[PDB]
Structures are given as C-alpha cells and as structure tokens.
C-alpha cells in the first residue's frame, strides 16, 4: 500500500535514473503506447528490474505535474481528441527540454485510524479546514465542511501535495500543512503522516521499501483531547440545561470591571 510518493527520486543516481527513463521510452516506444502510462521499476543499486505497467493515470500524478509543469490529465483529454502533443493544444516541450524544477511530495489524507490498525472510520464530517499557501497543492476528495463518508469506498478526504527547490524544504512545508489541517467528526491518519514526514530516514532520501516495517517509532502515543470541543460542550450544556444551583435565567448583564494590574 503506497503511503507517500516523491518526485523526482532522491539520492538515486543521475545516470541510473537516466537509464530507467530511457528504458521506459523503450518499452513504450516499441509497443506504440498511447495516452498516460506508468512504467514500474525496481531499484537495487545501479541495477533495476521491470515490475508491471499501469495503463492509465495515477493517484500520484500530482507530483509529476508540479516538477515539470505539465497537466497530465488535461493532456489525456487532448490525446483522446487527436491532439499532436507537439501541436499548439498541448505545448509539449520536446523530450530534450523537459525538466524537473525541485522536489514535490504527495500524501493522501484518509480516515484510517492509526490507533486501530488503519480501519477506515466513517460518519459525518462536522469540522473541516484544509491549508494553502506557498507551493502547496490541494486536491479535494470526499471531504467538505458538510457531509459524510461511507464504508463502501476508498476513504480519501484530501490529496495534499507540496513543492520547493530542495527536498528538505518541501518536507517541512508538507509537515506544516498536515498540522494546519483541522478535521473533526471522523478520526484520520494525519498523525501518522506527520511522523512519516518528520522522520530522519525520510529526508536523507535513502529509504527502502521496508522503510516502514523497521520503524516501530512511527505508530505513536497521542489521542488528542478535544481541547476546545470539550469547552464548547460545557458551554452548550449550561446554556440549554442551566447550571444545577443557580436561578436558570438568561445570562445576566454585568457591570464591566476594569481590572487593576
């Protein structure tokens, strides 16, 4: 289960990544591929292997849009209309000029309770704030200040994605939204993505596929008391049902006491 994606790769060498992208155009050139398509590979040192091929867009296309400035999805729709990718409708820069500018990261915020082995939680969403600002991309899914997520589907509140000149800049900046996020009503997985985001083994950029299993210090102790929620709850109780002791009338008017200091 893919948890977090980076564009482009890191630490992984510049020749290596060259021969892999070469190899990608090989397979697809050879069989005359058409539309968006992910060539999968597996990297063991200066050595890779083919795995499979996803013959459609991916969840993590975001990433590749942000480091090259190509709308993949809009392009799909123009390809299927007949577009030359080097005509005036797509504006594909020829392969030689296509670049990456910096590093981007995606993580999908879901309703998986990491306190309960990532069981999708459901119900109404009754408080919702996303983020925004500098090279922060947001793709809304199921989540809005209104209504509810059902057990039937891939839980995914928000695709959240960040972008900077340096990986470590993008990691900070991804952390900083994850926290601004404010979802209430359904538990979520943010707390676990934060710890992934802020792991030393992450930035160093040399992370294996077993990154996760050999790091127990990712599933970690804090349920969060509902600080101001418990407070709205007290206030709302007293207001409707009175305070047991005290002439249950409206809130009396009070002379403002300037307070010496």
């Amino acid at each position: 289960q893919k948890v977090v994606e980076v564009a482009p790769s890191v630490g992984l060498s510049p020749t290596l990544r060259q021969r892999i992208c070469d190899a990608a155009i090989q397979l697809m050139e050879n069989i005359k591929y058409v539309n968006a398509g992910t060539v999968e590979f597996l990297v063991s040192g200066d050595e890779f292997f083919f795995i499979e091929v996803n013959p459609r867009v991916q969840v993590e296309h975001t990433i590749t849009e942000m480091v090259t400035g190509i709308d993949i999805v809009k392009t799909q729709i123009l390809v299927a209309a007949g577009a030359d990718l080097f005509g005036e409708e797509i504006n594909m820069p020829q392969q030689k000029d296509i670049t990456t500018l910096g590093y981007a990261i995606q993580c999908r915020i879901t309703t998986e309770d990491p306190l309960n082995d990532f069981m999708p939680d459901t119900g109404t969403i009754i408080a919702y704030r996303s983020s925004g600002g500098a090279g922060v991309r947001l793709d809304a899914g199921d989540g809005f200040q209104g209504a509810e997520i059902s057990p039937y589907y891939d839980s995914l509140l928000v695709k959240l994605s960040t972008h900077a000149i340096s990986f470590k800049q993008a990691e900070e900046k991804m952390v900083r939204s994850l926290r601004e996020m404010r979802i209430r009503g359904v538990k979520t997985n943010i707390p676990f993505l934060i710890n992934v985001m802020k792991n030393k083994k992450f930035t160093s950029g040399d992370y294996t596929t077993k990154f996760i299993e050999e790091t127990p210090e990712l599933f970690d102790i804090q349920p969060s008391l509902d600080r101001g929620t418990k407070t709205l709850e007290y206030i709302g109780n007293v207001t409707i049902n009175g305070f047991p002791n005290v002439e249950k009338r409206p809130k009396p008017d009070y002379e403002l006491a300037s307070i010496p200091t």
Binding site: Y33, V34, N35, A36, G37, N54, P55, R56, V57, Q58, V59, D71, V73, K74, Q76, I77, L78, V79, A80, A81, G82, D139, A140, G141, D142, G143, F144, G146, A147, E148, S150, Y152, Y153, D154, L156, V158, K159
Partner: protein, 106 residues
C-alpha cells in the same frame, strides 16, 4: 473534438478530471451510486446521473453497460475511466468504441 465528457468514477479524480475538462471548455457528466448521493464529485460536474435504482456497493461503478446507458442518454463524446474501477477493463474500453464513445486511455 470533444464537446461533452463523462467520468466513470468518484472522489478526487472525478473532481480532478472535471476541473481539467472545464479548462478545455468541455461540458461534464458525473455518475454516482446511491450511497454516493452526497459525494462532492457529483456536484462538481455540469450534469449528474444516478447509475441505476438498485445497485449497492462498488457494483455501481463497475457496471459497464449501465454507465454506457447514462453515456448515450446524455450525448457524451468521451469517457474518462479515471483510475481504479474500469480504468483497466478491456470490456469497457471495447464497448465504448462500438458505441462511438471515445475511451480516454490506450
């Protein structure tokens, strides 16, 4: 040459495609199951149709022929399968063709 586009899918990616489609001045049709009554994505498209009265879980997004039903009934020139349902279904791809609906993909 695409005037009107349907998305055989739900959630972020239907939304992603709808935004993409608008950029291109193409009308959009969405589709939803029953329990997707109040999904964001259903509200983000120019037009929205229930996929059949009777279908339950995911079965509602995997029904090749009924999605085509909606597709024909609404004058659609192309379908974007998105990812995760029929995105990778030969049947769907093939049947789209036969009916003059452009399958977006390979």
């Amino acid at each position: 040459q695409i005037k009107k586009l349907l998305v055989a899918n739900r959630g972020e990616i239907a939304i992603r495609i709808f935004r993409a489609a608008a950029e291109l001045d193409i009308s959009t049709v969405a589709i939803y199951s029953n329990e997707d009554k109040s999904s964001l994505h259903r509200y983000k498209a120019d037009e929205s149709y229930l996929v059949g009265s009777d279908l339950g879980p995911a079965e509602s997004y995997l029904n090749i022929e009924r999605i085509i039903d909606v597709a024909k009934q609404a004058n659609v020139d192309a379908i974007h399968p998105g990812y995760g349902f029929l995105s990778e279904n030969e049947q769907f791809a093939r049947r789209c063709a036969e009916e003059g609906i452009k399958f977006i993909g390979p």
